[PDB]
């Protein structure tokens, strides 16, 4: 009878804002190549278009990427950027 205004906790199912996506790109550049290697594979998991290219190049498109991948990128970068300084 009335929408409950659902507030979900769907990591891999939430639409990410342009602001979030923007931060994602920043957070990825905040990662060194050593750690970038994982985020590359995270994308490749869904994106065979990246695999189509050379893994030297990261291929990300924050628009056609799904929350499943986008959030997983975030989840990784954010785990690395938690930092002993932000969290002592």
């Amino acid at each position: 009878a009335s929408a409950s205004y659902d507030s979900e906790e769907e990591e891999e199912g939430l639409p990410m804002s342009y602001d979030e996506k923007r931060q994602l790109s920043l957070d990825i550049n905040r990662l060194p190549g050593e750690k970038l290697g994982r985020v590359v594979h995270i994308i490749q998991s869904r994106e065979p278009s990246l695999r189509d290219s050379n893994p030297d190049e990261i291929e990300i498109d924050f628009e056609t990427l799904k929350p499943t991948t986008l959030r997983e990128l975030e989840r990784y970068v954010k785990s690395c950027l938690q930092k002993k300084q932000r969290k002592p």
């Binding site: 342009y18 996506k21 923007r22 790109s25 990825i28 550049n29 970038l36 590359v40 030297d56 190049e57 990261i58 291929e59 990300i60 498109d61 924050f62 628009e63």
Partner: peptide
């Protein structure tokens, strides 16, 4: 000439 929110690693 502006690209959408994408990012390359290394070269282009």
């Amino acid at each position: 000439k502006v690209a959408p929110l994408k990012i390359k690693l290394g070269g282009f």
